[PDB]
C-alpha cells in the first residue's frame, strides 16, 4: 500500500485461490516501558505505530500518537465485506488492532460451510473466499501501520467444527466459541453443542487462536442486568474450565465481560465490585472488556460518556482486550465515522489515564470487599445447586439460566431447553471401538492403533498429512450463486472508481446526517424536521434521534437521508500562513515597537485594546512593544509620537464613521506621514467597525482591519509587511 492511494479492492479479490495467510495465531501488544513521546513519558504505553492518525488535539503536542496496553477492538460487518475492507484500513490507522466480523444474521443455523460472497444481513456471511479476501487485505494494512492486526469472527452454531477447520486453515487469529451460547440463546441441542465444542476448541487451540466467550449475552437478556452477576460468573466458569480441560491455554481463554449498568444508575458503584470479584476468581485467564449496549439510546454523546466510564472500570481492574462499541449503535447500523470515533475514544481515555494506578488504588477492605465476597458466594451457591439438580443438563432443563432473579432468588421465568429438543436433537452418534479419524486436532476417541501403533500421536500420517499440515489439500470454492456475489456487486458501482458522493457504509450510498434545533414540541419538531430535509433535496429521510431541550422551548432532531446526486471533482474550484510560533520568533529576534490610538474625537477605546491586550489574543501575546496614547488622539499627535518614539508602526482606530470621518482620518494619517518624510519607513494599519480593508488601503494606508479582526491578523500583517519593506 501507499499512504496516498486507496486500497485496490478489485485487485485484492484476484487470485484468492492462491492466497496463503502470512501469519498464524493471536498477537498481544508489546509494552514499551517508560516511553518518551514528545514532551511526555508514559508508564502504560505499548509500541507506537509506524503510520497512524493522531487525536485532533495531538497537534498541540507535536502530533504524538501514544498507544495503550490492551488490544483494541472494532466491529466491522456491514453485509458487504468489500466495502468493510476500506473501513478496516481507516480503523487500523486510528489504532484498532483487533477487527471483529459479526456474521450474517443466524449463520449459527447453517449446517455446514457456505461458499462465495452473497450479500449479508446484519453481518457478513462467513466463507472461505470472504475470509481470504479480508485476511489478505489485513496483511497489507497491518504492514502499513506497522503492527499486527488480529482478525476475528464467530465459531458459534451447529457447524462449529466446520468453521473452526476453515478459520484454522485461513489464519483467523481469534474467535468466539461457547457451547452455552448455542444452547441458551439459539436453542441448539445441548448434547450436540457440547460434543461439537470439544472438537471446535481443539482446532482453535491447534491454531493458537484467542477465544472469547458468550457471557455478554446474559447482559442482554437480563431484565435488570445488575442482578445477573452470579449467572455471569457461572457461565464464565463453565466455558473457562471446559476450554482448559480440552487443551486451550489459559492465556488464550478470554472472558467477555461487560459492566452491567449505566447512568442514571450508580454504575461505577454497582459494577466495580463485580469487576474485582471476577478478576480475583479468574486469575490467570484473560479479560476481554466490552462496552455497554444494553442501556444505550440514540445520543452519541450519552453513549460516549458511558463508554469512558466503561474504560475507567477496565483501568481500575484489568483488560487484556478492550473491545469497543460505536456510539451510533443505538441509532443506526454503524457508520465508518463512528467506528473511528470509538477507536479514538478508547485510545484517548486510556492514554488520559496513563499511570493512574500509581496514584489511585481500590479500598479492597471495606464495602468493596464485602460485596466482592458476597458475589463469589452467590456464584458458589449457584454451582452447588447445579450439582444438586444432577448436573448441567438438568439445571438447563429446569430453567436455571436466563432467570430474572438475583440468584439465589429465582423468579421462574428462565429459558428451559430440552435435553432431547433444539436444533440437531438426535444427531449424536456413539463411537464404535473401531472409530477412526485420520486427522490432526481431533478430540475424541480415535482408534489408529488398529492400523498402526506408531501413528497414534499423528493420525494424519495415515494419509500423508491433512489440510492442517498440507495446505495444498484444501479445496477452494469461488462462487455458487451467479447473481448474488461480490463481482456483480462491484459492477454496480464501478462508476465510482472522478465523481463522488457521501457514504456511510457502502460505496456511494449517499447518506448524510442532519442535526437541528426547532423551537417547538417534540412530535411537531420531528415532522417539521422531515419537511425541512426534503426541502433540502434529501431522499429516504428518517429521524434517528430526538431529545427534548424543554417541552415547549424546543427539541433537537437528528435525521439521516440520501443525497440524490454526485459531484465531479474536476468541477471544483479549489484555491492553491504563519504560525503563532513563527510570528513570535520573528519579533523576539527583531523587536517591533508600535504606537497606537483611537484618533480624532472618537472615545470608543475597546476595539483597539481588543487587538492589543493579551486576553483575547492581542498583539501583546507575541511580544510587540505597544505605546498606547489612549483615545480622542489628534492624528498629528499620533504621527508625532511615532517619530519621537522611533516606532516601526502606527496602529489607529476609527469607530465613529459618520460622514466617512474614518476613511478621512486614515487619509490624513498617510498624508501627515508623507509630509514628515517618514511614510516610506513606517507601517500604518487602521481598523474599525465600518472599515473595509480595500477602501482603507485606497486612502494610502498599508492595511485596513474591520469586524472580527484579531491580534493574529494584525501581527501577521506587521511581520510580513516589515519583511516586504526590507
Amino acid at each position: 500500500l501507499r499512504v496516498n492511494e486507496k486500497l485496490d479492492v478489485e485487485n485484492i479479490l484476484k487470485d484468492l485461490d492462491k492466497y496463503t495467510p502470512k501469519r498464524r495465531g493471536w498477537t498481544w501488544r508489546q509494552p514499551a516501558e517508560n516511553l518518551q513521546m514528545g514532551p511526555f513519558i508514559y508508564k502504560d504505553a505499548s509500541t507506537p505505530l509506524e503510520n497512524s492518525v493522531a487525536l485532533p488535539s495531538a497537534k498541540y503536542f507535536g502530533d504524538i500518537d501514544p498507544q495503550p496496553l490492551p488490544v483494541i477492538t472494532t466491529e466491522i460487518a456491514s453485509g458487504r465485506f468489500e466495502d468493510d475492507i476500506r473501513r478496516m484500513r481507516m480503523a487500523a490507522w486510528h489504532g484498532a488492532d483487533h477487527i471483529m466480523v459479526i456474521r450474517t444474521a443466524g449463520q449459527s443455523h447453517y449446517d455446514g460451510l457456505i461458499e462465495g460472497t452473497p450479500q449479508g444481513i446484519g453481518g457478513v456471511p462467513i466463507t472461505r473466499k470472504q475470509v481470504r479476501a479480508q485476511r489478505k487485505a489485513l496483511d497489507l494494512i497491518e504492514e502499513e501501520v506497522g503492527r499486527p492486526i488480529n482478525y476475528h469472527s464467530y465459531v458459534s452454531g451447529v457447524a462449529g467444527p466446520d468453521i473452526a477447520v476453515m478459520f484454522a486453515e485461513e489464519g483467523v487469529n481469534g474467535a468466539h466459541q461457547d457451547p452455552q451460547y448455542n444452547v441458551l440463546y439459539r436453542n441448539i441441542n445441548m448434547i450436540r453443542s457440547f460434543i461439537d465444542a470439544c472438537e471446535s476448541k481443539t482446532i482453535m487451540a491447534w491454531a493458537d487462536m484467542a477465544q472469547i466467550d458468550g457471557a455478554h449475552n446474559a447482559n442482554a437478556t437480563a431484565r435488570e442486568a445488575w442482578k445477573v452477576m452470579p449467572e455471569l460468573m457461572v457461565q464464565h466458569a463453565l466455558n473457562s474450565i471446559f476450554s482448559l480441560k480440552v487443551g486451550m491455554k489459559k492465556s488464550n481463554i478470554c472472558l467477555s465481560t461487560v459492566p452491567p449498568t449505566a447512568p442514571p444508575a450508580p454504575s461505577m458503584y454497582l459494577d466495580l465490585p463485580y469487576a474485582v470479584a471476577l478478576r480475583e476468581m479468574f486469575e490467570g485467564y484473560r479479560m476481554r472488556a466490552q462496552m455497554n449496549t444494553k442501556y444505550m439510546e440514540a445520543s452519541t454523546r450519552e453513549a460516549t460518556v458511558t463508554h469512558v466510564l466503561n474504560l475507567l472500570i477496565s483501568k481500575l481492574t484489568r483488560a487484556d482486550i478492550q473491545s469497543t462499541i460505536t456510539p451510533d449503535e443505538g441509532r443506526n447500523v454503524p457508520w465508518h465515522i463512528y467506528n473511528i470515533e470509538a477507536c479514538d475514544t478508547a485510545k484517548q481515555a486510556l492514554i488520559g489515564m496513563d499511570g493512574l494506578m500509581d496514584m489511585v488504588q481500590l479500598k479492597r477492605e471495606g464495602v468493596l470487599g464485602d460485596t466482592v465476597r458476597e458475589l463469589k458466594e452467590r456464584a458458589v451457591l449457584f454451582m452447588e445447586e447445579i450439582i444438586e439438580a444432577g448436573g448441567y443438563f438438568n439445571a438447563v432443563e429446569q430453567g436455571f439460566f436466563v432467570d430474572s432473579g438475583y440468584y439465589p432468588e429465582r423468579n421462574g421465568d428462565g429459558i428451559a431447553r430440552q435435553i432431547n429438543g433444539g436444533i440437531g436433537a438426535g444427531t449424536v452418534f456413539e463411537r464404535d471401538e473401531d472409530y477412526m479419524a485420520p486427522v490432526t486436532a481431533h478430540f475424541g476417541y480415535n482408534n489408529v492403533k488398529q492400523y498402526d501403533e506408531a501413528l497414534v500421536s499423528e493420525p494424519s500420517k495415515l494419509i500423508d498429512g491433512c489440510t492442517l499440515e498440507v495446505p495444498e489439500k484444501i479445496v477452494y470454492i469461488d462462487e455458487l450463486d451467479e447473481n448474488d456475489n461480490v463481482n456483480v456487486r462491484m459492477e454496480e458501482t464501478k462508476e465510482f472508481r472522478s465523481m463522488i458522493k457521501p457514504e456511510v457504509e457502502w460505496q456511494a450510498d449517499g447518506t448524510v446526517l442532519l442535526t437541528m434545533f426547532l423551537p417547538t414540541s417534540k412530535r411537531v419538531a420531528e415532522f417539521a424536521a422531515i419537511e425541512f430535509a426534503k426541502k433540502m433535496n434529501l431522499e429516504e429521510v428518517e429521524v434517528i434521534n430526538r431529545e427534548v431541550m424543554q417541552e415547549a422551548e424546543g427539541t433537537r432532531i437528528e435525521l439521516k437521508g440520501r443525497v440524490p446526486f454526485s459531484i465531479d471533482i474536476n468541477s471544483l474550484v479549489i484555491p492553491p500562513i504563519l504560525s503563532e510560533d513563527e510570528i513570535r520568533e520573528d519579533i523576539e529576534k527583531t523587536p517591533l515597537k508600535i504606537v497606537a490610538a483611537t484618533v480624532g474625537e472618537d472615545e470608543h477605546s475597546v476595539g483597539l485594546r481588543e487587538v492589543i491586550d493579551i486576553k483575547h489574543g492581542g498583539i501583546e501575546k507575541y511580544g510587540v512593544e505597544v505605546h498606547y496614547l489612549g483615545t480622542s488622539v489628534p492624528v498629528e499627535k499620533l504621527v508625532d509620537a511615532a517619530i519621537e518614539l522611533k516606532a516601526d508602526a502606527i496602529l489607529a482606530s476609527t469607530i465613529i464613521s459618520h460622514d466617512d470621518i474614518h476613511y478621512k482620518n486614515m487619509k490624513r494619517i498617510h498624508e501627515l506621514a508623507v509630509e514628515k518624510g517618514i511614510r516610506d519607513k513606517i507601517m500604518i494599519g487602521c481598523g474599525g467597525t465600518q472599515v473595509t480593508p480595500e477602501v482603507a488601503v485606497k486612502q494610502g494606508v498599508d492595511a485596513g482591519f474591520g469586524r472580527g479582526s484579531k491580534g493574529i491578523h494584525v501581527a501577521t500583517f506587521l511581520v510580513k509587511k516589515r519583511r516586504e519593506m526590507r
Binding site: 455446514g112 472438537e199 451457591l381 439465589p408 485420520p438
Partner: protein, 109 residues
C-alpha cells in the same frame, strides 16, 4: 433466603472459597467432556472430511450417506480410508465415489 443458604460458606477463607468454586465447575463439565470423547456428530465428521481434502459440498454428501447407512460410529473419514485401501485408489477418488453413492455395499461388507 440468601442469608441462610450461605451459612455453610461463612467460615471458608477466600482461598478455600475459590478452590470450592473451581472444584465444582470441574465436576459440572466433566460429564460433558466425556460425551465428547465417546460420541460424534454430522459436524465433527464433516470437519474430519474437510481436513482430509474434501469440499464442504463433498463432505456433506458423504456424511449424509454415512448417516443413511448407519455407519457414523465408524467415522466418515475412516470409511473413506478403508475404501481407499480396499480398492487401492486415492482418498479423494474413494471419497468422490462414496459421495455419489458407490462402494457403500462394500463398506457394509
Amino acid at each position: 433466603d440468601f442469608q441462610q443458604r450461605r451459612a455453610h460458606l461463612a467460615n471458608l477463607s477466600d482461598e478455600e472459597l475459590q478452590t470450592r468454586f473451581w472444584e465444582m465447575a470441574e465436576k459440572i463439565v466433566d460429564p460433558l467432556l466425556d460425551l465428547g470423547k465417546k460420541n460424534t456428530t454430522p459436524s465433527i465428521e464433516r470437519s474430519v472430511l474437510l481436513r482430509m481434502g474434501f469440499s464442504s459440498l463433498e463432505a456433506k454428501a458423504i456424511v449424509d450417506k454415512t448417516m443413511d447407512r448407519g455407519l457414523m460410529g465408524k467415522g466418515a473419514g475412516h470409511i473413506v480410508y478403508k475404501i481407499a485401501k480396499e480398492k487401492n485408489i486415492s482418498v479423494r477418488e474413494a471419497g468422490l465415489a462414496l459421495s455419489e453413492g458407490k462402494y457403500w455395499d462394500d463398506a457394509i461388507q
